[PDB]
């Protein structure tokens, strides 16, 4: 789950990267405790439907 | 055009900043004499048709 995804960044003093959609990726940057980031330009484009 | 704008960035001693496709960027950045890089994420993502 990408709960599990942004926990185990979160948790992994920054040995952990983790490959989600930007629209996650945002979504997590604004929740406590603020402690993770998006970088680098998206791989690629595309929608949900 | 593309190529005065680049122009104006190589011969403007860091006093100007040119805002263009990535695709553009990208090629400029790989040709002499390798004066001028992309910076920053892309601000949108679309495509040519």
Redesign the interface.
């Known amino acids: 789950t990408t709960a599990e995804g942004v926990a185990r960044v979160r948790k992994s003093k920054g040995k952990f990267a983790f490959l989600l959609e930007s629209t996650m990726n945002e979504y997590i940057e604004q929740r406590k405790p603020c402690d993770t980031m998006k970088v680098?330009?998206?791989l690629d484009?595309k929608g949900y439907g």
């Open positions: 680098g330009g998206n484009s």
